[PDB]
Design a protein around this ligand. Structure first.
Ligand SMILES: O=C(O)c1cccc(C(=O)O)n1
Ligand SMILES: O=C(O)c1cccc(C(=O)O)n1
Length: 115
């Protein structure tokens, strides 16, 4: 509370580390469904069903232009990509399995980097 603070964690490398983790996700071979925004004009249903589209290139833009106030807001956008994937795709499909793989891949990098 006021004048009562926990020891300060050094957060000065967070931006560069998040950028590094995003790059590792983008080079994963199962990243292809997530690299660019879904085409809202060519994919029936997606615009109406998915209230908040997110993808790796949009995350890169936000990251590089200072639009994440902290670590956690970056993580939320990354998870949003995979939650959207799960909402719109059957588990038993290539894209469905891609999403599962990428989420697990991310959460490991995340844990290994910060926790
Ligand atoms: O690209 C878009 O934003 C889009 C595409 C198809 C329909 C609509 C719409 O009717 O709102 N919007
Ligand atoms: O964007 C739309 O098509 C829209 C607007 C208002 C309500 C609803 C709805 O009830 O789904 N959908």
């Amino acid at each position: 509370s006021m004048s009562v603070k926990k020891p300060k964690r050094d957060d000065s490398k967070d931006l560069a580390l998040c950028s590094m983790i995003l790059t590792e996700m983008e080079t994963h071979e199962d990243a292809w469904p997530f690299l660019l925004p879904v085409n809202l004009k060519l994919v029936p249903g997606y615009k109406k069903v998915i209230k908040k589209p997110m993808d790796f290139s949009t995350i890169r833009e936000k990251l590089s232009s200072g639009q994440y106030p902290n670590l956690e807001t970056f993580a939320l956008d990354v998870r949003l990509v995979f939650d959207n994937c799960e909402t719109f795709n059957e588990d038993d499909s290539d894209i469905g399995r891609a999403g599962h793989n990428m989420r697990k891949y991310f959460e490991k990098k995340w844990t290994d980097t910060f926790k």
